[PDB]
């Protein structure tokens, strides 16, 4: 029952730990893999899960990530653009995806145009890698042929990601403040 449900979960590709399944449950007499998927998508990957990523992927001694492995996005940075613009269209945008299993953090590079993943992707978004994915000199190579975005909505680290909005703080103009300069009302007719 629960054990075969977890086995089907692993076959589908969500390598979770028995503690994780027991934490993500339903009425404790029958649980369905769809329910586990739905609960897990809303759950941060660090809280639950197991270790399937080898602890050598950043070393560079591996070149293969066989298996339908699900990971979580932690940070997105445009490496084709500098830290002051992040939007200059002088080079095709290429994304340095920081991905995690909750145990070991790996890095991937967008080797093509991945329309599903953008700079506005919320951290905690789950990405499934299928078929064969190639590691080289550290980073993974990701494209549309093996990466699928499985939604993702986890409130605590989306609220943490709201530090992106906090970063855009051009409000430091001292205009309209209570103890500030008088404002310029627009002209009438």
């Amino acid at each position: 029952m629960a054990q075969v449900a977890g086995a089907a979960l692993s076959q589908a590709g969500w390598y979770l730990s028995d503690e994780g399944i027991e934490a993500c449950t339903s009425s404790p007499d029958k649980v369905n893999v769809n329910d586990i998927i739905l609960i897990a998508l809303n759950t941060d990957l660090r809280t639950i899960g197991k270790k399937f990523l080898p602890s050598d992927i950043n070393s560079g001694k591996v070149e293969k990530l066989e298996g339908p492995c699900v990971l979580q996005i932690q940070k997105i940075r445009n490496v084709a653009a500098p830290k002051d613009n992040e939007e200059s269209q002088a080079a095709p945008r290429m994304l340095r995806l920081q991905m995690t299993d909750g145990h070991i953090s790996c890095t991937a590079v967008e080797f093509s145009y991945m329309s599903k993943i953008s700079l506005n992707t919320p951290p905690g978004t789950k990405v499934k890698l299928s078929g064969i994915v190639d590691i080289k000199n550290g980073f993974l190579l990701l494209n549309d042929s093996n990466t699928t975005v499985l939604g993702g909505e986890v409130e605590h680290l989306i609220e943490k990601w709201e530090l992106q909005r906090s970063l855009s703080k051009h409000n430091r103009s001292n205009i309209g403040t209570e103890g500030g300069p008088p404002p310029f009302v627009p002209f009438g007719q």
Partner: protein, 718 residues
């Protein structure tokens, strides 16, 4: 008996030229009592009667606005009652000319007046000033018959002055009132602020001259762009990026230098893995070849903005100098009026005649002859603001009859005209894409098939490059070497005159060709220096002034209030606005802002003490800047400060205590290094961000309170 008609021009040379054109040679002339203007007489026909003519000229503006005198003394006055309490009067505008008396004695007996002033908005002000000067001394007439006339024209040329005479109209009091409103607004706001600052800073600091401080509704906004460029230059953070370069051998000696599609990579490890993908490979496979025809469009008709931009960038002439040379060229009759914002030729224009005029100059001779032989191409459609036609040639000129910069400007204007009436430049763009390993590089080249306008404008010609090898798809080429580079991003350069022209045109500040006036004003007042390449480098005084203005009230620097005011002046011009209403509104808002400026001038006094006083700018180094990553000096004056020498800004710190560094930690919002505040007696000390204590990041927290109530989800110290 024969009656008389009077004419007024803006310059004596224009008066003489128009009198010669209209009088068909027969023209008596004698000097006036002023010693600088001459009056010309002849006989012709007006309305339906044979009448005598009397044409004279003014010397630019005839009346200039100022105060009543008692309010003009800056030493003994309250420089806050100049807004809506101090009367204004147009006094004499160079009384050495005695223009009012000259006009009165000239029009002592007259029945008609026609005004040949420049057809710009500023010209109507002079038109109505001359009308005010001459109306009481003319004949009252029998009643109802039109007396005042207005001549509309764009070039001082034959049959153009004639058609200007054939369709006489009336002056525009709306344009006159717009000009008067602009003059009053400047003369009030700028003089009030300048007088207050001059009275405040006077002998206070050794290295600061009182008279060098000035404020203006346009000078400060146009200096804001230069100081903003300076701030970006001084607060630049260089970053290293890597570019892969591939060299391939075509047949035996030619080496194509391919460039990467990804252009740049800002990660050293990513660049290293991309090179590892490539350096072992010894072949390149061509994928796509494209030879597509493209056309480079002709330039639009020349307006004053583009003329000034080109005269600055290419001809090396300032905006005011270019404007004066263009006005002189118009005065002699070589070009049209160079105060035009229209880039579309009217349908009833003699383009073919203008081309036929310049059919003998050796430089552009074959091109003009072939254009006349074949069909004339229609100019590109553009903006049709309804002003004069674009700046176009009207008479043949040679370097011998012209001079230096004037001849250069005429040459550019004629070349632009020929380019406008011409054909597009056609070139084929050959692009070859190569695959090396998993990466794909490219190479591009341009081959000119038929030079069109890029024969009268050689500087716009498509650069010549050797043709790319003819390689079909699926061909293998040897690669010599592939290597990454360690390029670093470069800081922006200082704002050029052309870029300033573009910015002022975009933001709306500067209309009716007042941008050269503003630029020349901020250049004469030592706020910007014209360094090589026509670059406006802000000076210390200008940087400090604009930084203080930004600290006190941002709208005093940002180009918003001036843009709105100029828009309302334009609506004044187009008969839909109230002059009194707009003047009162602007005066009231600027009066409130001036009261706030007086009540909060302490912010500006601080940046001036640390900048223009050598005996009060020495302090111990302290926490880094947040824009410079440079040490900030901690001054021990009564208003304890924190001054950065790189970027001329100061930050206020609490008094009655001590300031100490807080373990090198850094604020996660402004990058500044936060310092602690020991409040005298033995007790708790709270962290304090130097930039947040002066500029709060959140609306709720006011100026001058530390991270105790920072009201920030981040900044753990809060």
């Amino acid at each position: 008996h024969m009656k008389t008609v009077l004419m007024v021009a803006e310059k004596p040379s224009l008066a003489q030229s128009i009198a010669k054109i209209l009088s068909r040679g027969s023209l008596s002339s004698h000097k006036g009592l002023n010693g600088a203007c001459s009056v010309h007489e002849y006989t012709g026909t007006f309305a339906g009667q044979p009448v005598r003519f009397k044409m004279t000229s003014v010397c630019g503006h005839v009346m200039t606005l100022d105060f009543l005198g008692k309010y003009n003394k800056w030493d003994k006055v309250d420089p806050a009652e100049l807004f809506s309490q101090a009367p204004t009067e147009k006094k004499e505008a160079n009384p050495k000319l005695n223009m009012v008396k000259f006009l009165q004695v000239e029009g002592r007996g007259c029945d008609y007046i026609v005004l040949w002033l420049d057809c710009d908005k500023e010209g109507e002000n002079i038109c109505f000033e001359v009308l005010d000067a001459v109306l009481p001394v003319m004949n009252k007439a029998h009643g109802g018959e039109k007396t005042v006339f207005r001549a509309r024209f764009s070039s001082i040329t034959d049959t153009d002055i004639c058609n200007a005479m054939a369709c006489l109209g009336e002056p525009d009091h709306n344009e006159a009132l717009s000009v008067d409103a602009r003059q009053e607004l400047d003369l009030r706001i700028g003089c009030a602020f300048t007088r207050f600052q001059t009275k405040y800073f006077q002998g206070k600091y050794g290295d600061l001259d009182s008279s060098l401080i000035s404020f203006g509704p346009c000078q400060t906004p146009t200096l804001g762009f230069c100081v903003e460029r300076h701030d970006k230059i001084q607060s630049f953070k260089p970053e290293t990026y890597w570019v892969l370069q591939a060299k391939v051998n075509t047949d035996k000696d030619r080496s194509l230098l391919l460039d990467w599609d990804r252009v740049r990579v800002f990660d050293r490890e990513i660049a290293q893995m991309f090179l590892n993908m490539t350096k072992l490979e010894k072949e390149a496979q061509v994928e796509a070849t494209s030879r597509k025809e493209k056309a480079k469009q002709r330039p639009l008709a020349l307006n004053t903005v583009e003329m000034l931009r080109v005269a600055s960038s290419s001809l090396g002439m300032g905006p005011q100098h270019a404007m004066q040379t263009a006005e002189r060229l118009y005065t002699q009759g070589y070009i049209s009026y160079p105060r035009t914002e229209t880039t579309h030729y009217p349908e009833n224009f003699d383009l073919k005649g203008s081309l036929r005029q310049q059919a003998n100059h050796p430089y552009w001779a074959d091109t003009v002859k072939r254009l006349l032989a074949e069909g004339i191409n229609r100019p590109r459609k553009g903006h049709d603001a309804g002003d004069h036609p674009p700046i176009t040639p009207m008479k043949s000129a040679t370097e011998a009859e012209l001079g230096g910069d004037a001849w250069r400007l005429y040459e550019y204007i004629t070349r632009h005209f020929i380019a406008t009436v011409s054909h597009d430049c056609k070139y084929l763009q050959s692009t070859i894409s190569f695959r090396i390993g998993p990466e794909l590089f490219t190479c591009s080249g341009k081959t000119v098939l038929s030079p069109g306008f890029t024969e009268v404008m050689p500087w716009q010609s498509v650069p010549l490059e050797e043709s790319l090898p003819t390689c079909q798809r699926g061909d293998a080429f040897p690669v010599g070497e592939v290597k990454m580079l360690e390029k670093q991003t470069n800081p922006p350069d200082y704002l050029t005159e052309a870029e300033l022209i573009t910015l002022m045109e975009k933001h709306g500040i500067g209309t009716d060709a007042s941008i050269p006036v503003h630029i020349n004003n901020i250049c004469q007042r030592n706020y910007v220096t014209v360094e090589s390449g026509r670059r406006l480098k802000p000076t210390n005084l200008g940087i400090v002034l604009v930084h203080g203005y930004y600290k006190i009230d941002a709208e005093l620097v940002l180009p918003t209030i001036r843009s709105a005011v100029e828009k309302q002046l334009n609506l004044i011009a187009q008969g839909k606005a109230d002059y009194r209403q707009v003047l009162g509104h602007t005066l009231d808002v600027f009066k409130r802002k001036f009261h706030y400026f007086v009540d909060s001038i302490a912010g500006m006094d601080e940046l001036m003490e640390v900048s223009f006083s050598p005996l009060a700018a020495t302090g111990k180094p302290l926490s880094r800047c947040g824009k410079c990553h440079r040490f900030m000096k901690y001054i021990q004056a009564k208003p304890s400060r924190l001054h950065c020498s790189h970027c001329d800004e100061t930050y206020t710190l609490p008094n009655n205590g001590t300031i100490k560094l807080y373990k090198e930690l850094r604020c996660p919002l402004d990058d500044f290094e936060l310092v602690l505040w020991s409040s005298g007696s033995r007790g708790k000390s709270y962290p304090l961000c130097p930039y947040c204590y002066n500029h709060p990041p959140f609306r709720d927290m006011k100026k001058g309170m530390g991270c105790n109530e920072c009201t920030h989800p981040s900044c753990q110290h809060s």
